[PDB]
């Protein structure tokens, strides 16, 4: 009834697929090689996201136990607690942040079903992962861009699900850094150097920020107000970017690859509708994103979790 989980691999060996300084031009050959090396990892993400999604959709505890069983197997197996193998960049580290994001959100969604023993196995595994992703960012030479925000998300979900205060604070510090880097024009200076993908990397930066804010809502706090609703400026900048790339075309001097906003709009349109500016994005079908927590449409409408912690 619950299918066998894939074996959990301690090592990650991902491959950077950008050609240029601006991290904007893809080598199709390196991109497929990375796809193939990370395919088992992404398959596990999609699966725990989807069985979690299933639990939020109908409340069948079977779905939640199969998710908890899959998470328990990878924990026992010490999945992703090994060597982050450097090929041409820090892709392996970035994959470990994205993987934590997916499994930690997936755990959060089924946490109310976790028996004492299942907690004892999954909690330390997620904490070991979250502390390794934190210690990366202790080194001042690491550019704290969208990677920091994405790394931040997984740490925050872990601090909330496993009830660890240090990991929660550290998740807050990541969200605060994103907000603090938003200029009066809704722009992130490190994301403005991404040439033809500048607009992509603003949507990509904003998504984990909106998702961390949403996890704060669960605990009772409002992070959306930080620095005078600064995140509203980023939101508006991205969604104005969806419709007209004129502003990004001028400020970078590179023609933007066209963007369709990601599933952050499903939550944000409920918090600051603006003038219905995210409704066109909202119309574009349900949003599935395992690294943001799965079915962002289901979670916005009916809640990240079924029973409030």
């Amino acid at each position: 009834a619950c299918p066998a989980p894939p074996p959990g691999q301690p090592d990650i060996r991902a491959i950077g697929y950008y050609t240029d300084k601006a991290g904007s031009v893809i080598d199709p050959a390196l991109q497929q090689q990375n796809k193939d090396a990370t395919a088992p990892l992404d398959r596990y993400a999609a699966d725990v996201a989807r069985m979690s999604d299933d639990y939020l959709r109908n409340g069948d505890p079977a779905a939640a136990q199969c998710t908890l069983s899959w998470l328990g197997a990878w924990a026992d197996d010490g999945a992703m607690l090994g060597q982050m193998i450097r090929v041409n960049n820090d892709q392996s580290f970035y994959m470990r942040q994205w993987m934590l994001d997916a499994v930690a959100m997936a755990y959060l969604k089924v946490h109310d079903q976790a028996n004492p023993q299942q907690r004892a196995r999954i909690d330390p595994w997620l904490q070991k992962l979250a502390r390794a992703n934190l210690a990366y960012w202790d080194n001042p030479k690491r550019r704290r861009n969208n990677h920091y925000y994405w790394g931040g998300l997984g740490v925050l979900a872990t601090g909330l699900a496993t009830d660890d205060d240090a990991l929660w604070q550290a998740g807050h510090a990541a969200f605060q850094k994103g907000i603090d880097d938003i200029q009066d024009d809704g722009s992130l200076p490190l994301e403005m150097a991404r040439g033809q993908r500048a607009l992509h990397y603003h949507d990509y930066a904003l998504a984990p920020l909106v998702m961390m804010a949403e996890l704060a809502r669960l605990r009772g706090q409002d992070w959306y107000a930080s620095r005078n609703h600064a995140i509203d400026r980023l939101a508006r900048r991205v969604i104005e970017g969806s419709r007209d790339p004129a502003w990004f075309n001028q400020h970078t001097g590179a023609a933007q690859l066209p963007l369709q906003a990601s599933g952050w709009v499903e939550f944000y349109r409920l918090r600051s509708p603006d003038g219905g500016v995210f409704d066109a994005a909202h119309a574009r079908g349900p949003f599935h994103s395992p690294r943001l927590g799965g079915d962002l449409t289901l979670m916005a409408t009916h809640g990240i979790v079924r029973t409030p912690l």
Side-chain angles (χ1 to χ4, degrees), residues 36-85 87-283 285-301:
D36 298 331
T38 56
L41 243 45
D42 286 326
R43 191 180 309 128
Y44 186 84
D47 274 337
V48 296
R50 185 190 73 254
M51 297 184 290
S52 277
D53 280 345
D54 285 352
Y55 174 62
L56 298 186
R57 213 182 308 287
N58 67 357
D60 192 347
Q65 278 296 140
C66 192
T67 305
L68 282 167
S69 190
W70 275 50
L71 288 168
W74 269 31
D76 297 346
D77 287 349
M80 308 181 295
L81 284 190
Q83 174 173 23
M84 303 293 110
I85 302 176
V87 199
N88 77 72
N89 70 348
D90 282 0
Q91 200 71 25
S92 305
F93 292 97
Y94 310 146
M95 195 67 31
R96 192 175 66 210
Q97 298 182 159
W98 287 318
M99 289 311 311
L100 179 51
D101 290 10
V103 299
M105 287 308 299
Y107 178 49
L108 181 61
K109 295 154 70 190
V110 300
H111 182 79
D112 68 48
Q113 285 295 330
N115 69 40
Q117 186 249 25
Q118 294 176 314
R119 304 190 168 200
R121 285 156 61 205
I122 293 166
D123 282 3
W125 170 62
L126 294 176
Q127 289 169 351
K128 289 187 196 88
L129 280 173
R131 276 107 164 220
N133 288 347
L134 257 180
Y136 180 81
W137 289 114
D138 291 321
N139 190 321
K141 287 191 307 213
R142 300 296 151 277
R143 292 193 175 79
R144 286 175 176 193
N145 66 338
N146 72 80
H147 294 308
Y148 187 51
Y149 319 156
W150 276 98
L153 174 49
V155 160
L156 192 61
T158 288
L160 176 61
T162 70
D163 192 13
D164 177 320
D165 197 72
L167 292 185
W168 180 268
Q169 255 44 73
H172 198 181
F175 169 75
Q176 194 57 265
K177 169 48 177 190
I179 298 324
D180 291 340
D181 261 47
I182 303 167
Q183 309 298 304
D184 282 335
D185 66 359
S187 81
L188 299 167
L190 300 160
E191 314 298 346
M192 283 312 262
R194 304 308 292 267
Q196 79 179 149
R197 292 203 141 81
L199 170 51
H200 170 270
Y201 269 120
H202 278 75
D203 176 86
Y204 194 72
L206 166 65
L209 287 183
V210 156
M211 280 317 300
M212 279 188 274
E214 284 299 328
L215 292 174
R217 268 180 57 92
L218 287 188
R219 255 194 78 185
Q221 284 108 278
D222 175 33
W223 287 5
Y224 278 115
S226 189
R227 310 276 153 151
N228 270 218
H229 297 277
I231 190 182
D232 192 61
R233 281 185 274 244
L234 179 52
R236 280 155 175 293
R237 170 58 59 204
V238 173
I239 214 72
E240 291 163 20
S242 321
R243 311 187 149 107
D244 197 357
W247 191 92
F248 278 101
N249 295 351
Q250 200 213 42
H251 283 227
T252 68
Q256 294 306 290
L257 293 164
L259 172 90
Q260 327 251 41
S262 94
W264 61 266
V265 298
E266 295 297 75
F267 290 94
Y268 197 73
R269 76 192 270 273
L270 295 175
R271 310 283 173 265
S272 200
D274 294 344
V277 297
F278 316 108
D279 281 347
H282 178 67
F287 287 83
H288 288 76
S289 187
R291 299 167 172 191
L292 290 164
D295 191 329
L296 296 177
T297 308
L298 176 58
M299 282 189 300
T301 316

